[PDB]
Amino acid sequence: MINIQEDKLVSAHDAEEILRFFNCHDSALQQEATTLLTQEAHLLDIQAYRAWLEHCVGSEVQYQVISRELRAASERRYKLNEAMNVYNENFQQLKVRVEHQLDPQNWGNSPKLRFTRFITNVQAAMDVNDKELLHIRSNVILHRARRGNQVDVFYAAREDKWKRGEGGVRKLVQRFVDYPERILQTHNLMVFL
Amino acid sequence: MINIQEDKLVSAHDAEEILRFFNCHDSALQQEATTLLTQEAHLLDIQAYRAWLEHCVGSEVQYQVISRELRAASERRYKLNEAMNVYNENFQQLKVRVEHQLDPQNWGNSPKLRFTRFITNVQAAMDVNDKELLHIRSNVILHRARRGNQVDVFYAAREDKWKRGEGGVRKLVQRFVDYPERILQTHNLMVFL
Amino acid sequence: MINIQEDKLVSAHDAEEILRFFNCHDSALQQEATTLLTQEAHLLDIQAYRAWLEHCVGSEVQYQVISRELRAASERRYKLNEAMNVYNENFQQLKVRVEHQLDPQNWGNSPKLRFTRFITNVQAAMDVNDKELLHIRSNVILHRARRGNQVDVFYAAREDKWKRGEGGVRKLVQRFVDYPERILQTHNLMVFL
Amino acid sequence: MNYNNKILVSESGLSQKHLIHGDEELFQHELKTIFARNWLFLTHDSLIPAPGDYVTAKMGIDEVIVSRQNDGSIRAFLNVCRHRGKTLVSVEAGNAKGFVCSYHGWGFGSNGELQSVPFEKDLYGESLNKKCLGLKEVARVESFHGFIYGCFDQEAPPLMDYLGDAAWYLEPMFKHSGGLELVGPPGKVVIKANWKAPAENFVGDAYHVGWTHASSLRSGESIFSSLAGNAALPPEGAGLQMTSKYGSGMGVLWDGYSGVHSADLVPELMAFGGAKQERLNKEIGDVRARIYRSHLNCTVFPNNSMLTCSGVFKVWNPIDANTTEVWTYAIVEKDMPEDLKRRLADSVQRTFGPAGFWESDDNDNMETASQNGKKYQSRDSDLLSNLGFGEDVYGDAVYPGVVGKSAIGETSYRGFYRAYQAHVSSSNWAEFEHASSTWHTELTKTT
Amino acid sequence: MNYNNKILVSESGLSQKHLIHGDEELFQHELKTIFARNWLFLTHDSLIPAPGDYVTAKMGIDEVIVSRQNDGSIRAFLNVCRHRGKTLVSVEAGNAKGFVCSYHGWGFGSNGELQSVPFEKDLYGESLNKKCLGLKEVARVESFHGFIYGCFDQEAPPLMDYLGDAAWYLEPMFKHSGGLELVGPPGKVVIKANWKAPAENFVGDAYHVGWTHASSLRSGESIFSSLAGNAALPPEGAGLQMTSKYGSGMGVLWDGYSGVHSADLVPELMAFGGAKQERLNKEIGDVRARIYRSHLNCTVFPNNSMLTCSGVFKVWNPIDANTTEVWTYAIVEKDMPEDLKRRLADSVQRTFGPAGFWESDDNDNMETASQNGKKYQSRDSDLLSNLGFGEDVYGDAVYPGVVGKSAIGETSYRGFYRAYQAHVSSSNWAEFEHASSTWHTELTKTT
Amino acid sequence: MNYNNKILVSESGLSQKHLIHGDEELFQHELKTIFARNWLFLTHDSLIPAPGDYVTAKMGIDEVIVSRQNDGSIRAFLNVCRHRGKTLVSVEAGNAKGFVCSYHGWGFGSNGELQSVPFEKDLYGESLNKKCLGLKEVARVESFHGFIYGCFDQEAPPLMDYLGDAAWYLEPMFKHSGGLELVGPPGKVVIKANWKAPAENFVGDAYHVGWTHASSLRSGESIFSSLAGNAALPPEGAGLQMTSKYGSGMGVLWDGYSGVHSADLVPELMAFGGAKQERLNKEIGDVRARIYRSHLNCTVFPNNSMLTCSGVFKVWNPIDANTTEVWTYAIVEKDMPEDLKRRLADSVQRTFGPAGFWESDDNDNMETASQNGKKYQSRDSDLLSNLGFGEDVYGDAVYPGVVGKSAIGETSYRGFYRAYQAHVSSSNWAEFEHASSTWHTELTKTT
Ligand code: FES
Ligand code: FES
Ligand code: FES
Ligand SMILES: [Fe+3]
């Protein structure tokens, strides 16, 4: 579909990702994906972080959100770390964050925060090799309101890998987000995208 | 699914709501819900308020939008009214608002306003008892532009009850929204979420 | 469905558009539409503008985005051009814009921009006369981040006409957007809605 | 700008410079001379009835904690830790015997006293003079029939004296009805207007009702619906206007007990207020008893407004010259049946709350009028409030204050701005009194 | 800052302090000394051709109603109610015999007169001096071949005198072509730049074209595409630059009648302008007839710009030092066929409109240059406009004004900023004239 | 406000006026007297190791290009074109031998020199004095063990002298460990706080750790987890506080080499720092070797902070009085194994990065404390930093600087604000020195 030598703004990675969704459209898979993401957003929205972990997150998960340094489109000499990790969590690291959220002394959680997620553009495709690896792509708008007049809205595309876990439940085993905004104007990125 | 004693940030109400969607996923119901909400958003967007009332709203409707007072997460003594009603309308009260919108002397309606709604995260489940009561959950982003440079964006989760009315048309009989932002930064909340 | 003499805020055009979606709900068509729009948003998001043109855009396309002058709701004498065209492109004009985007001297494209689209409220209906003309309606939130701290979010409803092109691929033959915000607060509207 | 000399408000309050609604330097100057000097609404007893109950409130741009003491009194304090100035309380209401700062853990009592400091003995030893480290306390906190006001200025008049002639009008509803309660929590919305725009509108603007609210009147079927789009004129002597020395004022619309409430509440209210009025005739007199069930649009200087009967209670919290945070509560009579109380509250919010269709009518008016105050060619223009000038009286045998014996007029604007000029050009309360020695004569000058 | 003494613009306009693009106090000072003093674009006859037709427009930060009177004249008024200052008209254009204020219903005529006040007899009686309550009127409103300008300053020169030497250049296209019309409505976009950034760019910046617009030139295939990425240089005498006493100026690119328009319009335009040029040779002379079909990038001081032939017409509406609201119209020749007119308008918007790919090229340039003006280490730095200095002439036998006989130079910047300094350091028009008695000598100093 | 006389900071740095965190005029004054005068962190050698490598950085509100010269030196320049002031470089890092302005194409070298101007000969001829048109260069650029600082003020002390007594504490980790590298790119987040809020918090605030970060300590299982919710007190002499003449200071928590890092990194780090400490005992002494593997929370005056061992490196970039742009890098020891380095970097960001759960704990503290500084009733209030006053010593036989021989105290706040007052009331470096002749005596006054 995409020739990156012609489509000059396209990253090799992006061209790779779009190819898996263009070939096989499994209508029922897209619907499964939709359900999975809707329920996950629902649990996150009501702040059921333990339920989230228990029901949506695989034990081998990699939960990654990066922030890419701004570099020339035509830059080809400078080769130092291109991105830093806002998140790069394994299951136990998520669990640390979850406990931090539930801790009665997390003063920033009082009064209670309000989250509202909007998941769109869901695409789903089984991996070519691992027949048990489901690729799901989706975009999120995440709205967080707190303390009367604080409002932060986050925007992102999520490249996920979901796999049937124990009890046949499909769980997230990889979430990768290249956060679009280099400098955050949201106070922090302390939300689960 | 959720243990609120463990998932300490979860409200009893929220835990209740998520349970109805997790058990039975009726794929065709979700699609009906989607259609219903899309058409309703479409009518609202073009400002066909009478059509909205006629085709989307049940005569026994309760249209409620609350604003919860900010209180300590660990507050258990203070027991005065927790929320006020931004909206708490019966069908006739909606109709008053609709007529106010159509009145040729509503100066604020000139020039004409522009609405754009984005409905996502639709979930649908029949009630356990009332086999004719459809529970629909959905999130809305509502964008309102007016007078050249005024832009207000609202964000909310809608807990609806829809029921087949006269002519078999499913109509809204209850909409409940706990508005996420305590202090509105949108001039007013004069929109139908 | 809509009586514009009663529903006084409704434009004749809007009433026309809603009628085509209310009659026949072709569930499989809505799903095709969804896929078409999701893939198109995906290509646009990764900036595969040539792929977009090649795979999503028909050779006879009209890509139109207008900005309507603010006039009295009760204005009936003043009859000069009601709108200007932010976009009114034929295929070759889109191609000029696409080449301008890919040009290595488009300084504004360095560092690389980040786009994220959220398509919702998809409705689809075949035209009554042209059995090969698919009407698709959808809303977009378009988020563009650049140069560290620039963030622009666009909101719009898209009235599209899609038609099977060469190789049976349904392509966009008409996109019409009446942009909701009269005065843009986004620096420019240099994005493909 | 020199506020000692600058004529911001003309003689007799006839006109104001449009800049007063847009000027940021003046806004800053108001913080000192208006908000730090005068009485400001905090809360109501019904909101903090039990010991330890507290709410936060704004006073000007400052935030304060208002707490019910063990002895049944109410004290208010700056919501600011005495150590490094972090905001102490992050919620809007609750119950507690103290407040702990989340930065370094300092514990303050509901009485504002510094009660504990983590590791005090080990770190501070005996150095810490806790006695001297209590929360900065609001000097004056007084009640008007359960309505709690605060004033940072110790030299201020007692609240009753401050209310002046306006108090006589409010007493039937605030005192003689058996008492009011405030139904919380309030709605909260930010509008892009100067605090004075809605303040002046509520203090004396009945003129805009018919036109501004044409659509709402028509739609709601409320008892004032005949004025929609200025179709009809309020009868001869359908009411009046009054104002007072310290700025408060109000419009009186006779008998409009159901007020802005849509037809669905008219019968019950009109029945309720009529029954009460009948008992009050015997206790306070026919006139005053009628005032009780008459619609008062009042501003308690400077930024607290209300519509009695309709039961709308507003605080116009100042943020900057073109930004205001509107708090909207419902006032209900304590002896009304619970269900009516509940429905009156909903109706108040329905009409004047965040999505109040009436309040919405007013938005553009308040916002553009304020924003135009910043526009170069308007800064030095004159907002007119000369309607009814030369017909107001003072010291009337029946209705006290400077009084316009007409439902529609700008009497109350004149009094509001007269008091505003006096404060703005004054450095303290004595200067204000000196500047206000001939206040009512100034207001009736051609009469 | 002392604007009487502060050298914001160096002698001969050679340099400007970078702060002029970021300084808010100076912005405020410009409101008085630039915008309240000079001629500002309002609209075009073609936009309000019939009696009662009106548009709103900005003048500086002020909003005005521009209305076609019954006698065929045009009067402009502050869009502000004379009562309590609410914005009178909320739409951008229409037709009406008057405007009613939605706050209290005051009715103003299209002539600005206070015509009706609700319940006037009953409330005001005979007190209201309506005659004295008309909308604040813009003192001066004049036309340049259908292009309507307004000026709040009665002491200003007539518009033709104000245009000075620049008028000679515009006349072939504005007058001799049979007339232009403005195709509305305009695009409207806010950019984060000072109004002077795009103003100076349009007044005399041909230098940036090849580089800034490299991608667009290349992509559009327009008649200037050879300059993409500074690949080629405009031939010897490919054009010139001029400027004038009151600040207006423009660049001239010979023969570029199709201008920025992509290849799809080049043949037709080049055919149209050539045919007209041929008729004009006989009427106005070869030179002037050629100017007609030559591309003029011009700024009419202070904040109105245009590209003749390309047909781009801009208003850089000031909001604050780093915010500007850009209005973009299309100018077309009245005698062009309708379809061409339509397509020229689309093409103008396509290239320079809200999504104009050319205008987009310029964003970052205008925005960062303006924003850098606020940066501490840049405030006192000098923006250079010394290109071609010491080679400009004045009083040429053929081309009037201070003229740089070179397509690319900063002649027009010099004249623009010379006039800007003079106004900013002047309290009124006489002082400006006194400060401008040697203007052209200052501009040609080393020549 | 008169900064020569205004006591913003009381004697001995005991208290500061709360307004210092909200006052915009003072913020502007800081741009001159703090940021244009002092040493500011730019980057690290490891970020620009090869010739032509460059990053952009902020210095105050200014943006600069920091470029590795061919001779191995580093020069820094204003990121602003010398022609009409457009921002030269739009990326955050790269490699190049020069920078071309996208407005008119001027080409500057990595050495800041104006190297090319399009059509120079044809347009400028020989007029252009390119030699005089190089990018405005940052006067002073010095290195502290690879950490690159810049200073616009040529009169400033060499960086080592500027670091004063603080340098002794950093050397074990910055010098004796074999060297540090900065892992980029940094996280970047805007918070609504004054730059001084996080600056003071990192310079000397160990007191807030137990309480502010209760949830994080508990959750992470880090080596300081015993302090969660002020459950335990750091042992007798668990550390100390120091400060210095030019404002820098830091807290020392003995042995806390794994610092804020969660249990998953504790063993490895504690093993690594212990092994290194053992080699260092022989080279630099037991004390200094222990300092190396001790947790230092330090601020290098004015707006650069760090947590050694934890490896957090911060720049608090000032935007306005209530806005700050936080840059977060990770510091790692060059000889650590790559995988540890990688994981330390992730852990640094995990705890203190844009989504750092620890850094999040601090948000509200920094933001409200800053925002309260604008609140009318708090402007003139006093932020207290009197903890441990009268127990600090100077000239100790072992630990240099003004030193509080206690883990928790406000010694470092005192020194920070003492230096801040001195600069703010000083017009240049000599005045600062004059104002600082008795600095340590002022800091130990009751001892
Ligand atoms: S700021 Fe409140 S305890 Fe320190
Ligand atoms: S403000 Fe216009 S009529 Fe009163
Ligand atoms: S602004 Fe950089 S070359 Fe002109
Ligand atoms: Fe009103």
Ligand SMILES: [Fe+3]
């Ligand atoms: Fe340009």
Ligand SMILES: [Fe+3]
């Ligand atoms: Fe901290």
